[PDB]
Amino acid sequence: MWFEILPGLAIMGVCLVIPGVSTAYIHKFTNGGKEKRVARVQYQWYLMERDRRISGVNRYYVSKGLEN
Amino acid sequence: GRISAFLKNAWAKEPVLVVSFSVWGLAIIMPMISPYTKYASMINKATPYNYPVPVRDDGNMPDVPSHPQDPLGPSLDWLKNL
Amino acid sequence: RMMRWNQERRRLLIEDLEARIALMPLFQAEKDRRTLQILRENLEEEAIIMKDVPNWKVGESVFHTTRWVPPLIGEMYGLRTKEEMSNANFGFTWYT
Amino acid sequence: MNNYIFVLSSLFLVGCLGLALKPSLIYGGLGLIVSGFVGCLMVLGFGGSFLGLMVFLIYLGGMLVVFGYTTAMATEEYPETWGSNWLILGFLVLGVIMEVFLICVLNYYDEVGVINLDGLGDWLMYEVDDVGVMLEGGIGVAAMYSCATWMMVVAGWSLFAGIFIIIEITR
Amino acid sequence: PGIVELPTLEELKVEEVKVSSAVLKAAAHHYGAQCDKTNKEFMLCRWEEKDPRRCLKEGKLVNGCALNFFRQIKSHCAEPFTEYWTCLDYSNMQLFRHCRQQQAKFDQCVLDKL
Amino acid sequence: MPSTFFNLTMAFSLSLLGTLMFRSHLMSTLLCLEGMVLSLFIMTSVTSLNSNSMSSMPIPITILVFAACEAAVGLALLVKVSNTYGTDYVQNLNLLQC
Amino acid sequence: MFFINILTLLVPILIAMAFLTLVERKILGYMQLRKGPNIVGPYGILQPFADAMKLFMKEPSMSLFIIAPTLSLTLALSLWVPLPMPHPLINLNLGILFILATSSLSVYSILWSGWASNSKYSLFGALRAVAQTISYEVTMAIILLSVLLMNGSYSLQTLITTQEHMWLLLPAWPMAMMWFISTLAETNRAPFDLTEGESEEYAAGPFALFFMAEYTNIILMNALTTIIFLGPLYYINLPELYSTNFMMEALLLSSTFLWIRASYPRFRYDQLMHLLWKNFLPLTLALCMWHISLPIFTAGVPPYM
Amino acid sequence: MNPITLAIIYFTIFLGPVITMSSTNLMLMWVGLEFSLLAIIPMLINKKNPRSTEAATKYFVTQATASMIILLAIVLNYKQLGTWMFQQQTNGLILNMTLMALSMKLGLAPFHFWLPEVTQGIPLHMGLILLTWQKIAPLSILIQIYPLLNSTIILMLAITSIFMGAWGGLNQTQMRKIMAYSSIAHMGWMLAILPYNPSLTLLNLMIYIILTAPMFMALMLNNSMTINSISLLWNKTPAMLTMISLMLLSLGGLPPLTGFLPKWIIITELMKNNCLIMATLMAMMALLNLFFYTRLIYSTSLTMFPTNNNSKMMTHQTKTKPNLMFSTLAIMSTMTLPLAPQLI
Amino acid sequence: PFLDIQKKLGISLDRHFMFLSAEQPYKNAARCHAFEKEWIECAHGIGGTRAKKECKIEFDDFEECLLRYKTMRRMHDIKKQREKLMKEGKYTPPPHHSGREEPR
Amino acid sequence: MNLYTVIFINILLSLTLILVAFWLPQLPFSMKFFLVAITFLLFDLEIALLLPLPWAIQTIKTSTMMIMAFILVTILSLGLAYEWTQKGLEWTE
């Protein structure tokens, strides 16, 4: 009966769920636990290039704090 | 009577046009009615997409404040009280 | 509900822009000092680079103004590497 | 990825050249689509995201579509292909060689004018508001609704009249 | 035709803040009033005179004020301020919505002590 | 900028040649017109975004709309021609010389 | 990293398209009271690979012949790039306009196929389908131009923070009743699949490519609906939950398409163009004006970061 | 063409020039030009016959190239300075291109081989507009920018128009083509005087209009578009002759009429500015225009050609088309020389 | 202009952005605002031929701000000489130009 | 670089598929259509004019944007209704 379509429904479900979590976890692994910043404007890009310049490593996924 | 008959006919024959024209009328008309319209311009004037360059005090202008947190300037409290 | 939510979004936007407002001055001064150092270095190098030629000048303002002049990224990063010139030009335009 | 704009420019040049060396229309329309694509990409590299996407959405989707539509429904590529394409291809090759050598000639006389080759990457963006929101072409194109309303009303009238004109023509 | 004046690298060398954008965006509001006279005066100098090479002595004062501000915030109420920016920087656009009930705490601490 | 701009002007000139010289068709001419228009719109938007000017941006939109309508009426005329002669050739228009 | 992400974005969607062909066959069979494929493998999870091998085994202007299907498929795959799930692969302001462009383009393939095939028979249907697709893409674009005024930005992330509280269907359902239909025309699905109903030139391989892109566009338009008019739950700690609810609603829409394909007859071309030009376009314009006025006679004028 | 369409098209035609002039932006000018082009094409192609369609194709193609060229000029000026208007600091090549385009758009020579064909394919009530409400905006553009022009090529163009128009008019029988060549020549006169005093181009244009429009009314009367079809006017309606003869001699520019005054004061300006050689060429080659006006005067009035019997069945009838403004303009053309100072 | 209907009605439809330094929407000033504001003020009150010769010191600077032909050439000659030196083997670019530094 | 990578990847994948496909085995006119294409144009141009609302709305001259929008929409609808009444949407020859 109608309980024979699940072996395709669940398949499509998992294979449409994989890309989202893939992207999220991958962005997070790269940028160190925090998501990938976005720049709809020049303001955020200025912030990002500033953090890049002061990272001491030339990468922006480093937030310093008050110990600088 | 003729109008009423025509609409009693259209409301079964071709409603699409009735809905369209009613929506059109509502759109052209309500803005002149509602009280919450001007508030939009007030808001989009308040929104500071730029920097408010200040001025000097070589005169006796008492309106402008010497500090942001002071009360002598234009308020918008109605925004949060909305 | 859409209205009551859009208004709250406008309030949040005002908050963020007020933060940016309070921070603009600092950033302005940092940027100014940075570009001034940049030009000073371009000059300290230009000196030795083009001292051996005839009737050449040093920081010769191509204008007759005495007015300050927003310098071009061309001038500033014209002696640094393609890396920086492009990280400047195509930075916001190549998706972060 | 410094030669970007020069490359896109040469490709637009070549598309318009393949349209000027009138080939069979089926193999000229591809040149035109390439031309539009590359020109939009140039605009984008400069920073007119809105303009580039407007092009992709209107020029190609709106105009080239109907060009091909009308062409097919009202044209026949009669056997005028006495190796005409195979001839104009070598002719195009000769022209592109001419142009390459032409630029390699110019660069000698003109150095800081026509083209600056040693520093080509430079001199695309001159200044920019680093800390500034609201600096994208969306605002300039939205102008028409607050200031410059004449543009909008004039385009509206152009369409309002083009409808009548087309229909009164076709009959 | 005409020489241009410029300052020297060896001068205008102040010890910058070098703090991150998240922290700046978080602490801004208070720094909006605290250290406001100086910043407003500097913006006025920069808008009146288009000479950054003349509007410099009003930048070192700015940075000194900002540092003497972050210094008080380091002395008092540091951990609320650290957890705060670690909560902000998590997001992408660093919005003040996903951290509300981690904000009023820091605010009340800063108040009850300052 | 200058290099790409001179090249765009060259492309305009090439479309000019394409329109001013025929190869026994009409759609080719109209497509060369479209190429002209594209180059012009591009040069204008480039000039604007390079000067950082905004209020001058409506102009590309305006001229693009006008070129759309122009090419539309041109295609309508081409179609009337094909449907009253039998094809879209050019050598059929030997009339009016009398 | 990035290549890994592109693989995660391209391989699973092809897998899902295959198993979607399967699900179609099965549901149509179960609505026509039969089973469907249950033999080639357990409950029919190998018929798609069987079809692939068979097609690539079948024997047959090369330029058009290749560029058309390739173009269509590449567009259909690129359409996926800018989607949020919940944080996207490529955050693009103007993303939905990029979507519309890359969805409209495939008309070029449809048209080149005809202009190549000398068959008047083929140009007939080619023109018809091209015209219907064009005319429906028009409204597909205007609906967005009338809704997105709720979030003053053409982005696709802002949709989520917007729908945080409520959805986008309780309002604008006079549109969803359309955006859930034009999607049945651009896709040339039922009840507008006349382009495959009246037949009197696609070989095996290019047919496989065309069909791949067709069902990809199906999945993608359904995802666009699930994102626009059926806002999911964006609790930042649960991107998994976001993706999961998105999956669910996408499957629901993709089975609704099949309910439709089974139940209804097909539209006569003239009746169809009448439908559009005389029922949807007036309503569409008037509703766009309505949603333009709403943020003026109401404070709800949204921001632009 | 139903009334709504007719009204909208007439409105757009009356608009295009108004905007092209009242606007100080070159883009708006180009826009008005496109307006005229578009809104006019139909009025040419209404009959939908092959000749009309052909003429429409020619017209549209030429004017399209012209408009795109002017657009190129404007954009180059933008890149050069920033303003959307022409100043005194623009590389002369841009002006030369603008001038080539305006010429091709008017009918000047050697950009003129498309005007006679079109004006032969067209009826009268649209050729009239084609000659008298499309050559205005393109001339206002020049009125705005006369100082910084290239007198050399302007004069070469003008005199070339004089010669070619006259030499073609010596032959063309078709009255439409004759009128076209006359337009060419008079616009040559204008462009010749232009960069010295524009009011005189304004005057030459108004005069050419006042002489053309009534001629086209007298033609619209009978649809007689040929010499052997207009010679029968002395038997169809023997009244229009005493005015047609005058108007044609005027167009020629005979002193006691008014058509002379323009050439006269124009030569005066060119003599003040030391252009007497080209002035002499113009004055000694307007005589061929005068010739092929005299040769139609002959055919119509000074000698009576064989008529056709059914003209009796016609005369039994009546006709009340010829409105008042026809005679009004005819008179205010022929008998208004005493009021030249009040014209300047 | 030609037909001053606009000035007669005391209105404006196009002439409020005829040039560069008009009122841009969100106060974003253009590139050569100042040079334009000076060129116009010198070319006001007078007409044409006066300005085409008594405003060059204010217009050449403007055209340069707008195009920077002379700055292009300056930088070009500098880089050409530098390349020739690094070829002959006399230069040695320091770090701040050669790939790193201690930035802000 | 990212979109370049993605697009090259998609194109190369499609071409691998087609190369596999190729290796493993071893007319009068209808005025109505042109009129419809023309309607499509004259609507895409409206779309180009109309898209910028999400930024034209955040300005201060609401009394202007509201109006101009209504104007465009209503005049376009007028042209549409005229085309209808004059039978451009009937398909019967």
Numbering used by the authors:
A (entry chain a): 1 to 68
B (entry chain b): 2 to 83
C (entry chain Z): 48 to 143
D (entry chain J): 1 to 171
E (entry chain X): 1 to 114
F (entry chain K): 1 to 98
G (entry chain H): 1 to 60, 67 to 206, 214 to 318
H (entry chain N): 1 to 344
From the paper:
Mitochondrial complex I catalyses the first step in the mammalian respiratory chain, electron transfer from NADH to CoQ (ubiquinone) coupled to proton transfer across the mitochondrial inner membrane, in order to generate the proton motive force (Δp) and drive ATP synthesis by oxidative phosphorylation. When Δp is high and the CoQ pool is adequately reduced, the driving force for reverse proton transfer across the membrane is sufficient to drive electrons backwards through complex I, from reduced CoQ (CoQH2) to the flavin. This reversal of the normal electron transfer reaction causes a substantial increase in complex I-mediated production of superoxide, which is then dismutated to H2O2 by Mn-superoxide dismutase in the matrix, and termed here “ROS production by RET”. Furthermore, mitochondrial ROS production contributes to the tissue damage associated with cardiac ischemia–reperfusion (IR) injury.
To determine how the ND6-P25L mutation affects the structure of complex I, the complex (ND6-P25L-CI) was isolated from the heart mitochondria of ND6-P25L mice, and its structure determined by single-particle electron cryomicroscopy (cryo-EM). The final cryo-EM density map reached a global resolution of 3.8 Å from 26,638 particles in the final reconstruction. The map revealed a fully intact complex matching WT-CI with all 45 subunits clearly present and was described using a model containing 8063 residues (96% of the total) developed from models for the WT enzyme. Comparison of the map and model for ND6-P25L-CI with published maps and models for the A and D states of WT-CI showed clearly that it is in the D state. The ND6-P25L-CI and WT-D structures match very closely overall (RMSD value 0.59 Å) and reveal only subtle structural differences in the vicinity of the mutation itself. The variant residue is located at the very start of ND6-TMH2 (on the matrix side of the membrane), pointing towards ND6-TMH3. In ND6-P25L-CI, TMH2 leans away from TMH3, relative to in WT-D (and WT-A), increasing the distance between them. Most likely this occurs because of destabilizing steric interactions between the variant Leu sidechain on ND6-TMH2 and residues at the end of ND6-TMH3 and the start of the adjacent ND4L-TMH2, notably ND4L-Met27. The structure of the ND6-P25L complex indicates how replacing the Pro residue with a Leu pushes ND6 TMHs 2 and 3 apart, allowing the upper section of TMH3 to rotate more easily and facilitating the spontaneous transition into D-like states. On the molecular level, ND6-P25L complex I functions normally for NADH oxidation but is incapable of catalyzing reverse electron transport.
